[PDB]
């Protein structure tokens, strides 16, 4: 019964407003503490350079006008409130593709009596990270993701990390991909003096057995025949069929491994370079 009166007292548009942000004592900064938690890395499309992950981001901030006298309202400590109505500092990706920027669910927020608010919505994020494809597949991928308020600079809000490492208490084994470390760092730009943001760096390692058994064994299996075609006796007249078939198979594997690799012209996959070199060798063989 008293909860309804308490909520109507707090969320009255005549008294509380949404479009303005709280502050005291001559435009003091309202510190916002955000930390991330990786639920499970659900997919990494390397061809499109898109890492789709599940994220729980927790945000804490102090707010003064939402307080109340705890003794009056039957000694209530914390109250749930909808996210749409109370003010919330925007915290959104920048390098995000697919257009989608903000969070998905807009969950309820817990408000204490002192004024501290603690809010965490779920989210699915589609980060865009460059694919360092050099040691395929024995590679380490370095995907960066940025958090920064697209609406506020470092004149009203300031972002500070709570924990130096992303939490993994809710992590589940992804299968193909394996995490190594999850460092987060608060960047600073002295030239602009307003650009402030948080970068989390996911360093990921691919488990090698799948692609190994699938591609590497047939590759070396069929390329071990390039140096073998010569041992065939020439009177039989069968060098041509074997050698042309080997060259055709090498071209097919080259096209396939080029279609699976992300089309980045900055570096060369080592397997592709090896195959091109042995293809030149086998055409010198056929001539």
């Amino acid at each position: 019964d008293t909860e309804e009166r308490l909520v109507e007292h707090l969320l009255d548009p005549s008294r509380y407003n949404k479009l303005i942000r709280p502050a005291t004592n001559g435009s003091e900064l309202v510190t916002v503490q955000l930390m991330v938690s990786l639920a499970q890395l659900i997919s990494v499309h390397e061809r499109e350079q898109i890492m789709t992950t599940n994220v729980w981001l927790t945000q804490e901030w102090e707010d003064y006008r939402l307080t109340w006298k705890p003794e009056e309202f039957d000694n209530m400590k914390k109250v749930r409130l909808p996210s749409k109505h109370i003010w919330l500092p925007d915290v959104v990706l920048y390098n995000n593709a697919d257009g989608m920027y903000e969070v998905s669910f807009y969950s309820n927020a817990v408000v204490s009596y002192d004024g501290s608010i603690f809010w965490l919505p779920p989210a699915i994020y589609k980060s865009a990270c460059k694919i360092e494809v050099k040691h395929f597949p024995f590679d380490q991928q370095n995907c960066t993701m940025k958090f920064r308020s697209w609406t506020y600079d470092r004149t009203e809000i300031d972002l500070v990390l709570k924990s130096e490492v992303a939490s993994l208490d809710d992590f589940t084994p992804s299968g193909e991909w394996d995490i190594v470390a999850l460092p987060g760092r608060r960047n600073e730009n002295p030239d602009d003096s307003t650009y402030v943001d948080i970068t989390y760096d996911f360093i990921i390692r691919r488990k090698p057995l799948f692609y190994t058994i699938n591609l590497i064994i047939p590759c070396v299996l069929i390329t071990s025949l390039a140096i073998l075609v010569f041992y065939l006796p020439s009177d039989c007249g069968e060098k041509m069929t074997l050698c042309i078939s080997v060259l055709l198979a090498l071209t097919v594997f080259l096209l396939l491994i080029s279609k699976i690799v992300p089309p980045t012209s900055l570096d060369v996959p080592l397997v592709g370079k090896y195959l091109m070199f042995t293809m030149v060798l086998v055409t010198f063989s056929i001539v």
Partner: antibody
Amino acid sequence: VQLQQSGAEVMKPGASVKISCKGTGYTFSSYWIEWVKQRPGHGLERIGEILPGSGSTNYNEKFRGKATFTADKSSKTAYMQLSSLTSEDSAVYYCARYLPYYYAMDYWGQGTSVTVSS
Amino acid sequence: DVLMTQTPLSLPVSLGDQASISCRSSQSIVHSNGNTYLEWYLQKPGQSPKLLIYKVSNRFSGVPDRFSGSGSGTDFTLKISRVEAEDLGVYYCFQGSHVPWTFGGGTKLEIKR
């Protein structure tokens, strides 16, 4: 931050010994925990590291099949099941936190002495 | 596994003398990003190891300036300016380039008279 280990442990050769690693004051299930073996004679050799969140484990090629780590998420405790133990592994065991490619190894344990003799 | 070779094994030097210790790798331990990840550890008798040098081109937050580290892509050298009574112990190398990780051999260091 703070780390705790188990007390002194003795056992006849061939049995199994399990030591505990307790960690407090930080996000326990967020980065690697590696253990260091120190023979009382000389040298420092590792035994392995684990990530208390996932089941990602690795071992040094020399100590394969000798130890098997285990992690718990509810209680911030890491255990290690030990295989057939011989008189050549009676040494002091450590525990430490580590995070690859970045700031790492800023704190340690206190040491766990295990002695195996008839 | 990339073995580590420390020189020398024992280097007695008096109080105030400059001491330089070399630590070589069997292979190249430079990462593709361009930073070499090596750690120097200091173990005292009866205590846990301490930190003095991480990311050799940088210095630890908490160790005095008397320690220094340098070297080329493969050869590495840890130098001390003035040995004090506290710097007694054993040094250790740690490479952080390839998996798995490994330690060094252990460099003994005491005073000489």
